[PDB]
Amino acid sequence: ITGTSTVGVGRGVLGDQKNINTTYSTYYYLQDNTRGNGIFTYDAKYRTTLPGSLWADADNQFFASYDAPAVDAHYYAGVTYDYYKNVHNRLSYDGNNAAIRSSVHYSQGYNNAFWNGSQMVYGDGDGQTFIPLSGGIDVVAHELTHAVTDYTAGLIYQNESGAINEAISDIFGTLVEFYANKNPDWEIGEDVYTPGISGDSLRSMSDPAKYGDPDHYSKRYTGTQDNGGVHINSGIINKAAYLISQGGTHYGVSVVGIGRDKLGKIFYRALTQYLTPTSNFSQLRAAAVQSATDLYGSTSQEVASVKQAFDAVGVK
Ligand SMILES: CCCNC(=O)[C@H](CC(C)C)NP(=O)(O)CNC(=O)OCc1ccccc1
Ligand SMILES: [Ca+2]
Ligand SMILES: [Ca+2]
Ligand SMILES: [Ca+2]
Ligand SMILES: [Ca+2]
Ligand SMILES: [Zn+2]
């Protein structure tokens, strides 16, 4: 909507205070004009009609329990925008500053979040498996990254291409979490998953097997559940990415770590210049090797490490 840019204050899902960019016109709306063509956050009001209504607030203070998922969806979308712009010179998910839209309070007891082809959508969780999912910066960045993938490589959401799609979202979700630098880790969704259980997470990139996800191609799932295991087989690629960044010896294969920034550069280039909708794991390896070659040279440690990592997870 048309109005003047304002700065509200509120509390997120985890109880932390933050400032948020709003727009004033009679009400204060969750509309951040400071980034691209705007970040807009909507109330789905426990229903499934999308987007719902642009979030309106009378006083620009967002401290009510009902406000918390909106505060975080809005704020973490901003952080994710900043990551892509500042680190990769990418303007929003389409590269042309597309408006970024999110809806919170989607459905009832909804233990998931998704990109619906046009916007991000966050459940509140049932209070047992999840609390409101926008409370996780890695989750928000995971969702926005699906939009980036859809506008670039276009990885089909099933089987190997779908597992790559998932891993790309986990990788950049994690890199955004490190970018913000608040309790960063290589786990996925730990801030909003299972409030009654400390120390766990939805997935682990450092050790996918801790939750039964494969960490080697020989352990890949080939059934039909979960679109051919897109949230399962992502572990194989997540592990490779973790090794590229952090190093380690995995099934006897040693990988020299090159750090998060170079991991991000290599995978961003692969995603935007080499991957296609039908890319499989072997083709991702080739794309990553070529990307590292472009960036660092054929004889570089970076190229050698990419090869080591894919060797370690059994992807040739
Ligand atoms: C919890 C179940 C698995 N979900 C996830 O791993 C993450 C959320 C995590 C990061 C907390 N959600 P996601 O992967 O975006 C869910 N994906 C999903 O719903 O895709 C299916 C789909 C939805 C709309 C349009 C096309 C296709
Ligand atoms: Ca208020
Ligand atoms: Ca964390
Ligand atoms: Ca995390
Ligand atoms: Ca937990
Ligand atoms: Zn996903």
Q: Which residues are bridge partners to 27 per DSSP?
A: 25
> Whose CA is closest to atom 4 on ligand 1?
112
**Distance (Å, rounded) from C-alpha 301 to C-alpha 297?**
9
- A 10 A CB-CB count for 131 gives 21
**Catalytic one of 88, 143, 160, 250:** 143
Best of 80, 110, 114 to mutate for ligand 1, by most ligand atoms within 8 A of CB? 114
**Closest ligand 1 atom, residue 202 Cα:** 11
270 closest CA partner among 179, 171, 144, 139: 171
Phi, psi of 189 (to 5 degrees): 80, 10
> Are the C-beta atoms of residues 44 and 104 closer than 8 Å to each other?
yes
Do the beta carbons of residue 44 and residue 103 sit within 8 Å?
yes
Tokens of 106: 């989607």
Using the mean position of ligand 4's atoms as its centre, give its distance from the Cα of residue 141 in Å: 10
Distance in angstroms (rounded) separating the CA atoms of residues 142 and 238: 13
Domain locations along the chain:
6-154, 155-315
SS (H, E, C) the chain: CCCEEEEEEEECCCCCEEEEEEEEECEEECEECCCCCCEEEEECCCCCCCCCEECEECCCEECCHHHHHHHHHHHHHHHHHHHHHHHHCCCCCCCCCCCEEEEEEECCCCCCEEECCCCEEEECCCCCCECCHHHCHHHHHHHHHHHHHHHCCCCCCCHHHHHHHHHHHHHHHHHHHHHHCCCCCCEECCCCECCCCCCCCCEECCCHHHHCCCCCHHHCCCCCHHHHHCCCCHHHHHHHHHHHHHCEEECCEEECCCCHHHHHHHHHHHHHHHCCCCCCHHHHHHHHHHHHHHHHCCCCHHHHHHHHHHHHCCCC
What are 245's two structure tokens? 């960044």
> Hey, whose CA ends up nearest to atom 24 of ligand 1?
116
Q: What token pair was written down for 159?
A: 């089987």
Residue 231 appears among annotated catalytic residues: yes
Cα atoms in the Cβ-side hemisphere of radius 13 Å centred on 143: 30
Among 146, 98, 102, CA closest to 121? 102
Are 316 and 288 spatial neighbours (Cβ–Cβ below 8 Å)? no
Query: How far apart are alpha carbons 232 and 217 in whole angstroms?
Result: 11
First vs last C-alpha separation in the chain? 51
Q: Exactly one of 160, 231, 250, 302 is catalytic; which is it?
A: 231
Yes or no: say if 46 and 98 are a contact pair by the CB < 8 Å rule. Answer: no
CB-based burial label for 174 (10 Å; 0-12, 13-18, 19+): buried
Cβ 173 vs Cβ 138: under 8 Å: yes
- For ligand 1, atom 20, the nearest C-alpha belongs to 114
Binding positions for Ca(2+): 57, 59, 61, 138, 177, 183, 185, 187, 190, 193-194, 197, 200
- The CATH number of the domain covering residues in 6-154: 3.10.170.10
Which structural technique was applied?
X-ray
Enter the CATH code of domain 155-315. 1.10.390.10
Contact 258, 245 (CB under 8 A): yes
Instruction: Check if the beta carbon of residue 263 is closer than 8 Å to that of residue 244.
Output: yes
Beta-bridged to residue 24, according to DSSP, are 4, 28
CA–CA separation, 67 and 8 (whole Å): 12
Site residues for ligand 1, CB cut-off 6 Å = 112-117, 133, 139, 142-143, 146, 157, 188-189, 202, 231
Query: Around Cβ 154, how many Cβ atoms within 10 Å?
Result: 15
CA gap 163, 149 in Å, rounded: 12
